[PDB]
Design a binder for this molecule. Structure first.
Ligand code: CHL
Ligand code: CLA
Ligand code: CLA
Ligand code: CLA
Ligand code: CLA
Ligand code: CLA
Ligand code: CLA
Ligand code: LUT
Ligand code: LUT
Ligand code: LUT
Ligand code: BCR
Lengths: 165, 217, 76, 61, 192, 76, 68, 194
């Protein structure tokens, strides 16, 4: 398919690796009882192994010569061959939660600078104000692009600068 | 006044004359998106456009979907109508989408420049004869002239009532379209079929039983 | 041939040729997006040996990387 | 120069609080070279929050 | 004022009385502005004259019996004819002559600013040298022109419905009136 | 980079190599296909036989370059 | 081919073009020591424009020898 | 001012009103500095005139039956002989490049020796249409509008031949034969996901 990679459900080293992990787990399994808790834990392990290999073969991942899933990081090639779930949807999910954390921290900083003890509200966290901003932070991309377009996202050149500049 | 929660405090940006005079004001901004008045103007416009296209869309779902259960109008399911129509059609869907992108982009840019400047699309000379009938009607998002032919917006004693009926039917049609998408992914049948199943057995056929919407139970 | 042709660019005692200070004073873009541009850089490259030494070391180091990368891959 | 308690802006370039805002304590009226006493709510690397400045190093902003 | 398009309703204050065809019909208020209204009076008279010519032409073609107005470019979608006599030209040459002649005539018309009723060599018989009967004929002209615009849109919609010419569809409406109209169509009213 | 290496080390330690994050270098493989390497199947500009660059350089210097770049027994 | 014709024509073309249309631009941009020429087209101008002539002429001869 | 490229938006304050083609179109603010703007007026008129002659040449080659604008240097790409209105031209590619280099270097150099001459007149204007100084602005406006349309048309020629691979007259024949089944969205190149 992409880059000479076969799909994992078509790959043979993928099936060999699945069979090898089952072989190691059953060689460890064959030295216990039946209803014993080590045997129960190893059968749960084998169930999770089979479920994991079936889910990775179901998700349409691409395997190499080693039988291991390879990820495709190109928006157009991923959206063309059905691989947006591995890099593209995770990167927009990450950027949503990372801007969430950063915007809630920025709103807490701006809220606590407007008092007579900003360092005291930085050492001892104002929990109601922090939870208020943490719930209100869900509209952070809209609020961020609005603060961008008003010219209030950015401080002017009243910043601290060195002698050189 | 009326609110989405009795006893909750109304946000201070939704309690001003400019916000209370809008339409459908119930004090619902818990995420604080409309604290900026320019943002609230832009979001008023975005709500009006999503309301009107959601009503037109959900009417195109329901009325053929209701009448296809009666005798006339053998209309396919709304998640199959694009395929059935493009088999019936003459053009490929890419060319049809390109034509609708140009034709919508013209009109959209007209609305965009009206949002930027209210007295904008009435430049004398810029249109052949459109230019006289393409100003606003002193309230942005509510144009006049060729839009609204029948003159229903002429009597002032009906005007807030027409506004509030529009914003309620629009929000309810947006809920209806999100429902159409959700039910389609969950059940696999049409929305009239979902309504017939909830009427045939309400206490056993719902979203608590479909095995998708809450899978912990 | 390319280096011999490129070695007739600059103005020695023969009338023809380019003047480096003139080239540097000319390449300043409009709108002030680079400010004064390359104004006054000839008297700061010419008078400083550490600027010339840093330029020479940057070029020779990048070329030494080029030598290694091209000699493993294209063995002469 | 500026009166007591008013906010100024420091333009001495090698100051720690250059391009920032402090508060005037007093202005000495002798022939002292740096009479404007400004306090700052943050400390420098020496842990000092107060410095003398000149009349052309402070701007009432 | 030629009348009232809806009795009881009032006339708009932007349409003057000394204008050919002033029934007061302006619901969308498209001509509240004078430059727009001037351009639309020009466009209304020009559309009316072209539609009179087109309706008279389609009637003449179908009554004289050489097909309808829809069969006339079928040789060129694929030899031309006129009065049954074949005409020795091709589509590209016809488009060339038509583009040159209409560009010349239209361009001479567009050089004049607000000329709607030119006279002169356009008016050889001199009916409009009285300034009163000329205005009554202006009113007759705008009424005939609106009627022919409605007639031509009826031709287009009627052919898109039935696939036949207007005289043949009029023959159907005279033969079976309660069995041949826009409702045995199956298109104009989608039910039944 | 450290997080991906530590992630893959935890996967290799816990006996599960099929969970480790293996991003494919599709940009540099695209560049190698642009150079004339028919391994990755992009097939464009020097790897496609119906290209202008291929057809123009094909008479004189490309037949040695293609053989040397499609040999997998060298560092080219 | 015709090597004398190609080299002599290319050198004549480049010397004529630098003598007649690019001389004033070269005198504007530059701002042995005495010639009889009314434009000051000296030995070094002859050397530069004839160098361009010989270079382009041998390039044309080489491309035509490759037949490309 | 010629008109307004986007109605209701204000014109940039650096574009003067008495200039041919002034629709107020400068989103990227490329002409805010006057010497740059003078050079862009010169270059806009020159590019427009070259594109007019190029589009007229491509049309006149393909309508009269001598291949398209892309088949015209193929006699010199391959081994062949030139032609013009069917009449052969007894020259080779090196000789023609010599003629073109000498002629264009002379003409271009004489144009560049002039300071900022865009509308010279005199020998360039033998029939004397711009000897009026009142219809001259209207004719310059017509000149810059036909030139912009010709630039857009020639870039259309290039992009259409890059995508479909035919001449513009044959592409117009396909677009008249099937306007919905033959366009840049039935292309397969211009929009990749259609
Ligand atoms: C406004 C009052 C009104 C009411 C209560 C009805 C009610 C009915 N009519 Mg209807 N009609 C009415 C107005 C009219 N009908 C008709 C012409 C007909 C016809 C020809 C037929 C009906 C039929 C029906 C039935 C539709 C049931 C169905 O499954 O349709 C869904 C199916 C289709 C819409 C097709 C129902 C008894 C049907 C009937 O009588 O069957 C028992 C039938 O065949 N109507 C006309 C002339 C246009 C009307 C005028 O307004
Ligand atoms: C980080 C840099 C980067 C690099 C090196 C690539 C590399 C690639 N892109 Mg990707 N792309 C990227 C980021 C990048 N992309 C981003 C950020 C987007 C969203 C804007 C895209 C959206 C995108 C689309 C829709 C497509 C590609 C495609 C490609 C492949 C061929 C195009 C090419 O060689 O252009 C070099 C890349 C750049 C100069 C980076 C900018 C990318 C621009 C914005 C899009 C380029 C698309 C291109 C015009 C389509 C060519 C079609 C192809 C069949 C010839 C190549 C592997 C095409 C493909 O699927 O090939 C099989 C394709 O259709 N890309
Ligand atoms: C063909 C174009 C056309 C144009 C430019 C005009 C222009 C005018 N009309 Mg006329 N009119 C027309 C056709 C036209 N008319 C037709 C066909 C009829 C018979 C139905 C009439 C019947 C009529 C009456 C009774 C009166 C006018 C009047 C006017 C004047 C003022 C109205 C105005 O300002 O709007 C400008 C008009 C337009 C911009 C029309 C353009 C087309 C619009 C934008 C879309 C129409 C689409 C149409 C509804 C589709 C029908 C489909 C069908 C299946 C339902 C103006 C000069 C008034 C007047 O004072 O007379 C001079 C008046 O009293 N008109
Ligand atoms: C100009 C006036 C006019 C006249 C005399 C006719 C006459 C006719 N039409 Mg046509 N038609 C017209 C305009 C007209 N039409 C317009 C404007 C449209 C687009 C809406 C159509 C669309 C149309 C379709 C789809 C069909 C016809 C058909 C017919 C024929 C059957 C009767 C019928 O059902 O009419 C249709 C009735 C209307 C369109 C409603 C009337 C609206 C008009 C414009 C009001 C003015 C009429 C006037 C007050 C009284 C008549 C004046 C006249 C004597 C000059 C009949 C010959 C049918 C046919 O083919 O018969 C076999 C048919 O299927 N017409
Ligand atoms: C056609 C291009 C052309 C070229 C390549 C030259 C080149 C030259 N001319 Mg010039 N000359 C030209 C056109 C040209 N001229 C024309 C059109 C005229 C008539 C106006 C002259 C009238 C002229 C005079 C009077 C003299 C030159 C001289 C020279 C030589 C000056 C440098 C030198 O002494 O080197 C070797 C140089 C060879 C000088 C010379 O010494 O001639 C040999 C000299 O005295 N030329
Ligand atoms: C190609 C050369 C060229 C040049 C030098 C100019 C220069 C000018 N134009 Mg003109 N213009 C051009 C082409 C050009 N234009 C074309 C082809 C059109 C039709 C689309 C126009 C339509 C136009 C309008 C409506 C107006 C102007 C105006 C102006 C003047 C001020 C604007 C400015 O400063 O931008 C400087 C312009 C450039 C630097 C152009 C260079 C091209 C840029 C850098 C990149 C373009 C890439 C291209 C879009 C890629 C296409 C890829 C394709 C596959 C899609 C300036 C004299 C304004 C004016 O006052 O008229 C005198 C004005 O109102 N132009
Ligand atoms: C100068 C105007 C112009 C005209 C009349 C045409 C006409 C055509 N183009 Mg071309 N083309 C143009 C410019 C033009 N193009 C430009 C600027 C580009 C680069 C973006 C292209 C790139 C291109 C490609 C890749 C293809 C075509 C194709 C075609 C044909 C099918 C229609 C289509 O899908 O076009 C494409 C539509 C556009 C590029 C949008 C046009 C936007 C215009 C330039 C804005 C101004 C238009 C103006 C408002 C009204 C038209 C004026 C005109 C009548 C004089 C049709 C004959 C297709 C073909 O070959 O069919 C067989 C095809 O595959 N064109
Ligand atoms: C207010 C607020 C505030 C605070 O602060 C915060 C928060 C809470 C966050 C917020 C909220 C929000 C929300 C809820 C939202 C939602 C929305 C929606 C639902 C939309 C839809 C929307 C929707 C829409 C538009 C839709 C539309 C539709 C359409 C057109 C359709 C179409 C169609 C049809 C006809 C048919 C065919 O066959 C197909 C189709 C094509 C499909
Ligand atoms: C007034 C007003 C006002 C308010 O304010 C608003 C409103 C209401 C909107 C408005 C209204 C409007 C309207 C009604 C419109 C309509 C129009 C029309 C119908 C036109 C036609 C129009 C039409 C026309 C011109 C036509 C023309 C035609 C022609 C030439 C034809 C031709 C032909 C012929 C011969 C035959 C052949 O075989 C072919 C052809 C080629 C086909
Ligand atoms: C204005 C502005 C402003 C703002 O600020 C910004 C922006 C927007 C960016 C801008 C825009 C721009 C643009 C649009 C541009 C475009 C251009 C073009 C297209 C050019 C062409 C241009 C073009 C041209 C010259 C062309 C020319 C051509 C030619 C000569 C041709 C020739 C030929 C012929 C005959 C045929 C044969 O077989 C071959 C050949 C040889 C091929
Ligand atoms: C006086 C006179 C005259 C005459 C003139 C003449 C005849 C001139 C000539 C001149 C000449 C005749 C010059 C020449 C020059 C040349 C040169 C200066 C050359 C150089 C060369 C080179 C530099 C080369 C190089 C190379 C080599 C060695 C190898 C290979 C590569 C190459 C090619 C790069 C006339 C009659 C007109 C007029 C009167 C005056």
């Amino acid at each position: 398919d992409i880059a000479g990679l076969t799909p994992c459900s078509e790959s043979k080293a993928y099936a060999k690796l699945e069979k090898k992990e089952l072989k190691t787990l059953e060689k460890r399994l064959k030295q216990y009882e039946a209803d014993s808790a080590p045997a129960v834990a190893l059968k749960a392990t084998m169930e999770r192994t089979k479920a994991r290999f079936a889910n990775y073969a179901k998700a349409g991942l691409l395997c190499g010569n080693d039988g291991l899933p390879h990820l495709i990081a190109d928006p157009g090639l991923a959206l063309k061959y059905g691989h947006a779930g591995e890099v593209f949807i995770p990167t927009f999910g990450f950027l949503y939660v990372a801007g969430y954390i950063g915007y809630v921290g920025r709103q807490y900083l701006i809220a606590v600078k407007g008092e007579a003890k900003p360092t005291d509200k930085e050492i001892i966290i104002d929990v109601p104000l922090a939870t208020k901003l943490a719930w209100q932070g869900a509209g952070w991309p809209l609020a961020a692009v609005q603060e961008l377009q008003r010219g209030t996202l950015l401080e002017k050149e009243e910043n601290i600068t060195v002698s050189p500049r | 006044r009326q609110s989405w929660l009795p006893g909750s405090q109304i946000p201070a940006h939704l309690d001003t004359p400019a916000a209370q005079a809008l339409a459908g004001n119930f004090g619902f901004d818990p995420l604080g998106l409309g604290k900026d008045p320019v943002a609230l103007r832009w979001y008023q416009q975005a709500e009006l456009i999503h309301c009107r296209t959601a009503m037109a869309g959900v009417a195109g779902i329901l009325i053929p979907g209701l009448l296809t259960k009666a005798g006339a109008l053998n209309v396919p399911e709304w998640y199959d109508a694009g395929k059935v129509a493009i088999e019936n059609s003459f053009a490929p869907w890419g060319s049809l989408l390109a034509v609708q992108l140009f034709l919508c982009g013209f009109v959209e840019a007209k609305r965009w420049q009206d949002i930027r400047k209210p007295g904008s699309q009435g430049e004398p000379g810029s249109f052949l004869g459109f230019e006289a009938s393409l100003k606003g009607t002193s309230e942005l998002g509510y144009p006049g002239g060729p839009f609204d032919p029948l003159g229903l917006s002429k009597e002032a004693d009906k005007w807030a009532d027409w506004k509030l009926k529009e914003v309620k039917n629009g929000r309810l049609a947006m809920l209806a379209f999100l429902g159409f998408v959700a039910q389609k992914y969950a059940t696999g049948a049409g929305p009239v079929d979902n309504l017939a199943a909830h009427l045939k057995d309400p206490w056993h056929v719902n979203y608590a039983t479909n095995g998708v919407s809450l899978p912990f139970l | 041939v390319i280096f011999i042709v490129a070695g007739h660019m600059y103005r020695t005692n023969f009338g023809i040729g380019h003047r480096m200070q003139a080239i540097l004073e000319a390449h300043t873009p409009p709108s002030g997006s680079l400010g004064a541009g390359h104004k006054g850089l000839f008297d700061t490259v010419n008078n400083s040996l550490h600027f010339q030494l840093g330029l020479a070391l940057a070029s020779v180091g990048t070329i030494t990387s080029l030598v290694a990368q091209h000699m493993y891959s294209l063995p002469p | 120069g500026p009166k007591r308690g008013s906010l100024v802006k420091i333009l001495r370039p090698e100051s720690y609080w250059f391009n920032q805002v402090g508060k005037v304590v007093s202005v000495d009226q002798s022939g002292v070279r740096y009479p404007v006493v400004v306090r700052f709510e943050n400390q420098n690397y020496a842990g000092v929050t107060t410095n003398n400045y000149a009349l052309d190093e402070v701007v009432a902003a | 004022k030629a009348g009232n398009w809806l009795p009881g309703s009032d006339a708009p204050a932007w349409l003057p009385d000394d204008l050919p065809g002033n029934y007061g019909f302006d619901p969308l208020s498209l001509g509240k502005e004078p430059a727009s209204l001037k351009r639309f009076t020009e466009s209304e008279v020009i559309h009316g004259r072209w539609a009179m010519l087109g309706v008279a032409g389609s009637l003449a073609v179908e009554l004289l019996g050489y097909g309808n107005w829809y069969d006339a470019p079928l040789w060129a979608v694929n030899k031309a004819t006129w009065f049954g006599i074949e005409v020795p030209f091709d589509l590209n040459a016809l488009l060339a002559f038509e583009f040159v002649a209409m560009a010349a005539a239209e361009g001479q018309r567009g050089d004049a600013g607000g000329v709607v009723y030119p006279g002169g060599a356009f008016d050889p018989l001199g009916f409009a040298k009285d300034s009163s009967k000329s205005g009554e004929l202006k009113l007759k002209e705008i009424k005939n022109g609106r009627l022919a615009m409605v007639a031509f849109l009826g031709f287009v919609a009627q052919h898109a419905a039935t696939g036949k010419g207007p005289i043949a569809a009029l023959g159907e409406h005279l033969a079976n009136p309660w069995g041949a109209n826009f409702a045995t169509n199956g298109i104009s009213v989608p039910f039944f | 980079t450290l997080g991906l290496y530590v992630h893959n080390d935890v996967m290799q330690a816990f006996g599960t190599p099929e969970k480790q994050i293996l991003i494919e270098p599709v940009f540099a493989q695209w560049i190698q296909a642009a150079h004339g390497k028919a391994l990755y199947g992009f097939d464009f500009l020097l790897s496609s036989k119906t290209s202008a660059a291929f057809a123009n350089g094909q008479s004189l210097w490309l037949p040695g370059w293609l053989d040397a770049i499609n040999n997998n027994q060298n560092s080219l | 081919l015709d090597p004398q014709i190609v080299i002599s024509g290319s050198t004549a073309a480049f010397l004529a073009i630098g003598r007649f249309v690019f001389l004033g631009y070269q005198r504007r941009e530059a701002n042995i020591f005495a010639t009889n020429d009314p434009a000051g087209f000296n030995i070094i101008d002859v050397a530069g424009w004839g160098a361009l002539g010989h270079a382009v002429g041998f390039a044309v001869l080489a491309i035509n020898s490759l037949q490309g």
